[PDB]
């Protein structure tokens, strides 16, 4: 209902702000898989247990949420509410700009004997330890691409702050054995990198 | 101390119908107002519209104003959400939150779960994945599980029951159109050891209440 913008970045130490703009504030933080926290009130206030960083900013045409010397545990999701019922301002995105790119490492196991044993088949492609989070996987059948039994998560933050994804080809016992090889292809920033297995192996 | 606390997750199939409860303690129910919100996977806040815990009238978002109810118990201090005729689009999590009036929103439940799938709870397949030195270094191999076609979430997956834990990687689910989750797990061990050493595949799923030991052989 409301406008924000889709998506902010800056650096440690950086200041940061996010947007928020007639029939219509309270800012809410929410960190990944839990629920929403009261960010800003009144829009000049913080409640206990917020930092000095957050300062939030009335204009009387629109409101503004300012992060002044951004911190790594902020990056999260930031929520504006104003208001005649209670209305939502959408989602923005904010992701540090920090840390280096890395180069993902890719793993691929064709299916066990005892996957095809039971009428059933299954290429597995793991890769690990890549930023940022953005990588495209494609699917080979002998140098000829492959979509159809493709699946694929959206990579997610590991332990170590880099980024994971795994990519699932599911096959027919016949199709696995008719080819002379099945490859995951990975790319990651301009490069790539296909791992390659055989049923002959 | 100020807390709203919700029910756990909720997996029905379309058609059926769920109640959400919200349990407000540390002030009183009656004076503030509960609203409820939603939020499907990877999407911003829905709000839905909010109950007054006054009267005991709701008053629904249009859209919302069908098939979704909100209801209250004074005596149990307890603000519901009843939603019928559920269906796929419904999969989200639902808060609950007090209205301080010119605070928010400022207290909000841990939120609820509800998953509403087709797919009937399924144990996993568990299948294993052989040794493989290429991608690792140090004269080390890879080795893992294929835990296959499991529904609903979570997975439990250990190595040699617990006792091998450094070179563990679980990586998380990938829900396929099935619906159904796969994931895979690999631990890391050194070359030396295989194949005098023995490693089992410890996979744990309570929603089916399945377990099992699956061991890792190295080839043919």
């Known amino acids: 209902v409301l406008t924000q913008p889709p998506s902010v970045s800056g650096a440690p130490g950086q200041r940061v702000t996010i947007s928020c703009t007639?029939?219509?504030v309270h800012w809410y933080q929410q960190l990944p898989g839990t629920a929403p926290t009261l960010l800003i009130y009144?829009?000049?206030n913080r409640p206990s247990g917020v930092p000095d960083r957050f300062s939030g900013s009335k204009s009387g045409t629109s409101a503004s949420l300012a992060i002044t010397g951004l911190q790594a545990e902020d990056e999260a999701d930031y929520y504006c509410?104003?208001?005649?019922?209670?209305?939502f301002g959408g989602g923005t995105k904010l992701t540090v700009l920090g840390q280096p790119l890395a180069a993902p490492s890719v793993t691929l196991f064709p299916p066990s004997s005892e996957e095809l044993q039971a009428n059933k088949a299954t290429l597995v492609c793991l890769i690990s330890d890549f930023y940022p989070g953005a990588v495209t996987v494609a699917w080979k059948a002998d140098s000829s691409p492959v979509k159809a039994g493709v699946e694929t998560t959206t990579p997610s933050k590991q332990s170590n702050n880099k980024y994971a994804a795994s990519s699932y080809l599911s096959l027919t016992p016949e199709q696995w054995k008719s080819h002379k090889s099945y490859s995951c292809q990975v790319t990651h920033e301009g490069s790539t990198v296909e791992k390659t297995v055989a049923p002959t192996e | 101390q100020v807390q709203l606390v919700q029910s756990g997750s909720e997996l029905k199939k379309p058609g059926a119908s769920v109640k959400v409860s919200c349990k407000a303690s540390?002030?009183?129910?009656?004076?503030?107002?509960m609203t409820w919100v939603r939020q499907a996977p990877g999407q911003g806040l829905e709000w839905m519209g909010w109950?007054?815990?006054?009267?005991?009238?709701?008053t629904y978002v249009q859209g919302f104003t069908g098939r979704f109810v909100f209801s209250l118990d004074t005596s149990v201090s307890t603000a519901f959400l009843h939603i019928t005729s559920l269906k796929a689009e419904d999969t989200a999590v639902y808060f609950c939150?007090?209205?301080?009036?010119?605070?928010?929103?400022?207290?909000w439940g841990q939120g609820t779960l509800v998953t509403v799938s087709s797919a009937s709870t399924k144990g996993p397949s568990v299948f294993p994945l052989a040794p493989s030195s290429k991608s690792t270094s140090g004269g080390t191999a890879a080795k893992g599980c294929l835990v296959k076609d499991y529904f609903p979430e979570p997975v439990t997956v250990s190595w040699n029951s617990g006792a091998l834990t450094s070179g563990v990687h679980t990586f998380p689910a990938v829900l396929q159109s099935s619906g159904l989750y796969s994931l895979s797990s690999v631990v890391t061990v050194p070359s030396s050891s295989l194949g005098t050493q023995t490693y089992i595949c410890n996979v744990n799923h309570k929603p089916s209440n399945t377990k099992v030991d699956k061991r890792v052989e190295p080839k043919s």
């Open positions: 939150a007090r209205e301080g009036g010119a605070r928010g929103f400022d207290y």
């Open positions: 540390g002030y009183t129910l009656t004076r503030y107002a």
């Open positions: 109950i007054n815990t006054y009267t005991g009238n709701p």
């Open positions: 007639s029939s219509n």
């Open positions: 009144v829009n000049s």
């Open positions: 509410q104003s208001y005649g019922s209670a209305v």
